[PDB]
Amino acid sequence: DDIDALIEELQSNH
Amino acid sequence: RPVPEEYLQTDPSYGLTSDEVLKRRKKYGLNQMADEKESLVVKFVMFFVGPIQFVMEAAAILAAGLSDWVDFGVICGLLMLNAGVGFVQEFQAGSIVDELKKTLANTAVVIRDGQLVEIPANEVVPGDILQLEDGTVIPTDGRIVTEDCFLQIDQSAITGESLAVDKHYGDQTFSSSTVKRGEGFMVVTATGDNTFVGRAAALVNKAAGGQGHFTEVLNGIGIILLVLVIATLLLVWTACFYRTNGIVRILRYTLGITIIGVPVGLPAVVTTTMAVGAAYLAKKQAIVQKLSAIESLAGVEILCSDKTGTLTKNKLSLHEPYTVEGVSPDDLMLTACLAASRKKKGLDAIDKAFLKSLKQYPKAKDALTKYKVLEFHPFDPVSKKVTAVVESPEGERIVCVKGAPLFVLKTVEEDHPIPEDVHENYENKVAELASRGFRALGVARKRGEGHWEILGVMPCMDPPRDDTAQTVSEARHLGLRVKMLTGDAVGIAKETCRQLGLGTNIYNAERLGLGGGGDMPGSELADFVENADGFAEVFPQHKYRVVEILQNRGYLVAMTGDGVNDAPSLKKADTGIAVEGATDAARSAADIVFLAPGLSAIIDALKTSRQIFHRMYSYVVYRIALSLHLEIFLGLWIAILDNSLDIDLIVFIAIFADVATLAIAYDNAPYSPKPVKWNLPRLWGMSIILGIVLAIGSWITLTTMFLPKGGIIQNFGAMNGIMFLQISLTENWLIFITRAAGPFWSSIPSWQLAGAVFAVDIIATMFTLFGWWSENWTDIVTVVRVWIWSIGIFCVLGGFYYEMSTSEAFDRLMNGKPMKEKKSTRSVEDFMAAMQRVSTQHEKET
């Protein structure tokens, strides 16, 4: 799962 | 030819095998641009090829045989000038394309027989898998095949600016680009002379000879110039027949006239300008299939752009959510995300949008990890709701439901009667989002055995791209009107128009007509499709109709296309645009293939194309005006006074005129706002007026110098020297005039062009001072006075050019067409009112 990692990879544009 | 898809279907974990790598090396080749070294040969190639070149070298041989060293020197100087200007032009083009093809990153990482290995980028071959890490540089054209985390690349980063874009499964990654973030695997499609960058370089190299519509217009310009040259030759020969003169004198005069009357540099210079412009467009993520497109994009008047790819990010995002009183947006977002599958598999675009927008709600991000999901019912099409029973950190079971607004409202109502005010407000808001095109997701939660509580709605839609409203306003500043074509309903697209500020005046493509039906009159339908701000529910058949009717009005149309079904319209479009991700059929049927998604890239390439066109047009007008000025002045001189400039001075004038070519490619390019359409009648009127003004100034100098006491001569000087200086000054300063988009003082010329022109003027001043190839020395005082008079002529040229180029009256006079139609000042308002009425009715059709 690892939701938070998926969250950041989905918003990887900073 | 594009590689077959079979080569691209390789296993990302095992990769290709070494023997097949070798066989494809035999088939396709290395990632290496071809290098050629023929610097010595091309210099004499310019000497030989070209009919004017053979006839003029034959004339040189004849003059050498007749022991007339003078005309032999004239022809040798002209030939050396032509060879030099051609060689420097081709050298500039070669340097530009080598900068375009510069690839020094190499360092390819691939996997052979399942084993990762690092090889130089040359060894790669199309149909191969390459590993992409953070910070890596793309060696060859390819496509991203694997998706674990979305990738960000700098494909737009060829100039200093980066403008990174995102790439996912299916996106087409591009050579000479740097990876800014992300990782994955990439299947390479082309490796050399087949990638669009290499294809553009090869197109420039092939077009160094010259082919296209601009070649035809160059042929027309050259034919007319030869016509004027024959005219002034007839004038001088008639006037020198009336006065019985030696045939040597007449031939010297005709040589002097033909040195400058025909510009032998126009074809090569315009062709090189197109080549360098195609290179610059390739720098701007826009490869023209033909060089003519560079002009075709320059004069485009209407831009019909697809909504899904250009004016929107194409990503289903999240918008500001409506919430019920007493429920915070953070709690609502946490509830919505908790109703989503923890497993990555199964999440649709709505869920991805929710967990993407989770950034704005840190409380939800911190709280989601504290809930343990007990059970999960995924999206059921019948109930249209996803359910998730989770365990709170306090031990409370929480039921999370997200789905259709009406269905969620009924589900909450099925357990407890919602107050009528909340229900009415919620329904009104749902209808309001429906009118704005947001797809709405209702969210509800259940705490243990307590009642259902609904928290709000989720507006989701593809937003305008970040640089779109700015881009739309800038395009409006560029004199071209943007019409959006979308497959969605009129109501959905009206909100998109409002977001872009286009003007929210759209129509259903089918109902308005465009399909052989509809009771709207043909003229009224044409006016509607001309003045509309967009078209909703568009279809591939309607796009062709829109292009056809728009072109029937004389409007240059630029149509963007993605699918294969758009191929005919792109062919019918005056400049078919293939946006990023377009099918290979659409790219083949397009005129200019784009690389960076978004209307900003299209408008930037349009600005670059306008710059290229204005550079070429400025050079053409400047050189034709120089030819006209010298033709008129010298023809009148030998017709009336039986004299002309020294022939070597004429050669030096021609050399100075062609020297500004060596710097015209290096200057800062100002682009005209309004479209540029190769207005040949206007161009010829402009050139004739400028040449007449220069001839008038030169004749004023002649008339002044004829009087005793000097006239313009202060103590002493030379007739030929002073006239040569004045002609050089008033001629080579015209490039400062034509290069400007408007008045000559609006745009400051670059250091290269100004330096070249000033060096030419300094050399001419030294020629006049020291009397080289002239009768007598000319002192500094009359030289600076000639400089001042040439500055005055430069200023009057500025006035004439500003008042004639920017005046539509002169354009009407030259073209000969009347003052358009001058539609009644009140019927235009009634027509706009009818536009609005039909747009409202098309919205109300639903």
Distance of CA B248 to the CA centre of its chain: 53
Does residue B548 contact residue B564 with C-beta atoms inside 8 Å? no
**So where are chain B's domains?**
5-30+104-138+141-188, 203-284+609-815, 288-314+464-595, 317-461
Local structure of B99: helix, strand or coil: helix
Restricting to B residues 349-368, those with a Cβ less than 8 Å away from any Cβ of A are: 352, 355-356, 358-359, 365, 368
Domain range B317-461, its CATH number among 3.90.230.10, 3.40.50.970, 3.40.1110.10, 3.40.50.80:
3.40.1110.10
3 state SS of B453: strand
Of A1, A7, A12, the CB nearest to B355: A7
According to the annotation, is B566 in a ligand binding site? Answer: yes
Chain B CB contacts of A10 under 8 Å are 150, 352, 355-356
> Given the structure tokens 């062009």, which residue do they identify?
B753
Give the resolution value in Å.
3.5
Which of B112, B179, B188, B105 has its CA nearest to residue B144?
B188
Q: Is B181 on the interface with A (CB under 8 A)?
A: yes
Q: For residues B403 and B386, is the Cβ–Cβ distance under 8 A?
A: yes
Considering only the beta carbons, identify the residue of B342, B359, B365 that sits closest to A1. Answer: B342
Three-class SS state of B151: strand
Beta-carbon contacts of B209 under 8 Å, excluding residues fewer than 6 positions away, are: B271
Are the Cβ atoms of A11 and B181 closer than 8 angstroms? Answer: no
- What the block records as the tokens of B797 is 């040229």
One-letter amino acid for residue B374 of the chain: L
Which two tokens mark B704?
């002044």
- Are A3 and B359 a contacting pair at CB < 8 A? no
Q: A3, A8, A9: best mutation site toward chain B, by most B Cβ within 10 Å?
A: A3
Angle, CA B421 vertex, CA B412 and CA B844 arms, to 5°: 90
Closest among B227, B228, B138, B128 to B177, alpha carbons compared: B138
Determine whether the interchain pair B359/A11 forms a contact, defined as Cβ–Cβ distance below 8 Å: yes
With a CB cutoff of 8 Å and minimum separation 6, the contacts of B192 are: B28, B29, B30, B31, B32, B33, B34, B140, B198
What CATH topology corresponds to B203-284+609-815?
Calcium-transporting ATPase, transmembrane domain (1.20.1110)
- Calculate how close chain B gets to A5, using CA atoms only, in Å: 10
Token pair for B811: 């354009």
Fold assignment, B5-30+104-138+141-188: 2.70.150
Do the domains at B288-314+464-595 and B317-461 have one common CATH topology?
no
Q: In what order do the strands lie in the sheet with B108-112?
A: B115-119, B108-112, B129-132, B184-190, B141-144, B172-173
Contact B368 A3 (CB under 8 A): yes
CA-wise closest residue to B265 among B225, B294, B211: B225
Please state, in angstroms and rounded to a whole number, the distance separating the CA atoms of residues B8 and B25.
15
8 Å CB contact of B166 and A4: no
DSSP B507: -
Which of the following CATH numbers is that of domain B288-314+464-595: 4.10.410.60, 1.20.1560.10, 3.40.50.1000, 3.30.2090.10?
A: 3.40.50.1000
- Say whether B562 counts as a known binding-site residue: yes
Q: B317-321, long-range: CB within 8 Å, 24+ apart, which pairs?
A: B317/B353, B317/B356, B317/B357, B317/B460, B317/B461, B317/B462, B317/B463, B318/B353, B318/B354, B318/B356, B318/B357, B318/B458, B318/B459, B318/B460, B319/B438, B319/B459, B319/B460, B319/B461, B319/B463, B320/B459, B321/B456, B321/B457, B321/B458, B321/B459
CB atoms within 10 A of CB B31: 25
| Neighbouring residues of B679: CB distance < 8 A, sequence distance ≥ 6 | B811, B814, B815
Q: Which of residues 1-14 of A touch B (CB under 8 A)?
A: 1, 3-4, 6-7, 9-13
